[PDB]
Amino acid sequence: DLTISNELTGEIYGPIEVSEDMALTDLIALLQADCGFDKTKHDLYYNMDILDSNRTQSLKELGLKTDDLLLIRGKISNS
Amino acid sequence: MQIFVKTLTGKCITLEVEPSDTIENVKAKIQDKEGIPPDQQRLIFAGKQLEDGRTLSDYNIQKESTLHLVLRLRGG
DSSP states (O other): OBEEEETTTTEEOOOBOOOTTSOHHHHHHHIIIIIOOOSSSOEEEETTEEOOTTOOOOHHHHTOOSOOEEEEEOSSTTO | OEEEEEETTSOEEEEEOOTTOBHHHHHHHHHHHHOOOGGGEEEEETTEEOOTTSBTGGGTOOTTOEEEEEEOOSOO
């Protein structure tokens, strides 16, 4: 139940179906394409924390469940 | 009818509503339970945003509908 909410532009996306066998980078790709996320000039808020380089763990390791939500923030006045 | 509202914190809340219930009224029920002000409450159903001045039947919201409650946080 991927709940992508880009509160920077006020754009909410539809609920995407995720899987444990799904690569993190694959999801990130969709995020950078559809949502417009960026791993250089954007900050990814996972639940209540930031996706740091230390968190190289995949979805099935980060703790994905029935409710998966990704918040897009950062940019300028936030980072 | 009963609906399911999932918050960003990963909480599944069930609310008792009617097909003729207004979105704003639903927000009031959320406010009464969670305490979060209606102004900071952004409800989205199936990717479609719900306006306070609209009803559940307007968005075809039926029983056991899964809604997403986004909170417009001023800080981050």
